[PDB]
From Swiss-Prot:
It comes from Human respiratory syncytial virus A (strain A2). Belongs to the pneumovirinae M protein family. Residues 2-109 are annotated as: Interaction with M2-1. GO terms for cellular component: host cell cytoplasm; host cell nucleus; host cell plasma membrane; membrane; viral envelope; viral tegument. This is Matrix protein.
Amino acid sequence: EMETYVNKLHEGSTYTAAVQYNVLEKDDDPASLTIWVPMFQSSMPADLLIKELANVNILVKQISTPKGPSLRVMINSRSAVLAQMPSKFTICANVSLDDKLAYDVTTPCEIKACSLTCLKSKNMLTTVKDLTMKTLNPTHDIIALCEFENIVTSKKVIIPTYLRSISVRNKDLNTLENITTTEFKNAITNAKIIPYSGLLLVITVTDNKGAFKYIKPQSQFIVDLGAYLEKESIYYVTTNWKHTATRFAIKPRE
């Protein structure tokens, strides 16, 4: 038994699979950690692929690298389609680990939950890094304010995540309508936050005007929240933090 989650944010038969496992070390006093698999494309219907993703075996090994502690992940599978999926990769230990793991010892883990999110094909995904350097002398930073309610404690949590920097004409500041266009505002209001990279904000870019200038129309603009979750348990977060709204701020730089 295992919890499974399928989020279809795209209708294509072909999609980018964004997969995240919550796992428990097979031991007494077990380490708890979350693994996200490098994105890969598939054309197997999501509701079938999740069945295959649920039947893998995971091992991890904590290592030291120039960037700090890292987790080497190995995924065993008898499912033909998972030839499509990376089987060996590394992720940052600080985001992955809740807590409890020895170094350089390959460690089997029990899968508690598997989440599969279907995104657009990779050529239709835009990252924050993609937009860095598009404006050389920005005047403002655009921040998404991701609001959650912890359903156990009823407390509200806001994670402010950086989207991009932009230069705004003086004339445009008086209403901001040419920057925070109708398309932009709706896209933020309707943004989704899914279980990947800890959490991943996904904004559908419906236009390339204003705050969306230089982005490919109809792309999904994907943004990491994992850097803000290093001191949390990701499994606790994806189980207990309910995404209640997404707001934005267009902050002057200085």
